[PDB]
């Protein structure tokens, strides 16, 4: 029962594409495996993803974030087309991870960009993510309980020097 237009992908086709794309662009497959179930609806034979409204596809991108990646030179279709597609959305998730990793490491020198921190950056955007890490307050607080748990864990990991 889920706590309260779609496209459906099978687990196999998502897995195959993740395996291929993650290898090609140097983003861990485990990050995709972490993020996809948080952002989308898990069903028996795969995942369903919302492709209407402001946030769309497996990465739940908005147009501004998607276009930000294109501005960096990433080869993506237009937001409205790519966000409904398997491969383009997976590339975008990964490209965004790579850019957010750079942003995190530049502001918090000597710190490690973990999956939950990467998800926080994905969820809030890099500016607001850094603001949450410093202030403890989300700029965009209207998130799911799973998203909130993930970003809380992210801040915990950020602050603490080591596993413990
Ligand atoms: N996942 C992106 C998080 C995000 C990024 C930007 C905004 S907005 O201020 O431009 F409406 C809102 C939410």
Author numbering: 48 to 51, 61 to 220
Copy text from the publication.
Lysins are lytic proteins that locally degrade the cell wall, either to provide access to the inner bacterial membrane during infection or to release virus progeny by cell lysis. P5ΔV8 adopts a lysozyme superfamily fold consisting of an N-terminal lobe (NTL) and a C-terminal lobe (CTL) connected by a central helix. The two lobes create a substrate binding cleft containing the predicted catalytic residue Glu95. However, in LTs, there is only one acidic residue, typically a glutamic acid, in the vicinity of the substrate cleavage site. Φ6 P5 adopts a lysozyme superfamily fold and our structure of P5 bound to a tetrasaccharide substrate analog shows that the enzyme contains a single glutamate (Glu95) in its active site. Together, our structural data unambiguously identify Φ6 P5 as an LT.
To understand the molecular basis of the thermostabilization of P5 by the V207F mutation we determined the crystal structures of P5ΔV8wt and P5ΔV8V207F at 1.4 Å resolution (we could not obtain crystals of P5wt or P5V207F). The structures of P5ΔV8wt and P5ΔV8V207F are almost identical, with a root mean square deviation (rmsd) of the Cα positions of 0.135 Å. Residue 207 is located on helix α8, facing the hydrophobic core of the protein. In P5ΔV8wt, V207 and adjacent residues 153, 176, 179–180, 194, 199, and 203–204 create a small (30.28 Å3) cavity lined with hydrophobic side chains. The lack of electron density within the cavity suggests that it is unoccupied. We note that P5ΔV8 forms an unusual crystal-packing interaction in which three N-terminal residues (residues 48–50) of one of the two subunits in the asymmetric unit insert into a shallow groove in a molecule in the adjacent asymmetric unit. Given that residues 48–50 make specific crystal contacts it was surprising that residues 53–59 were disordered and only residues 48–52 and 60–220 could be modeled. We will refer to the largest fragment, residues 48–220, as P5ΔV8.
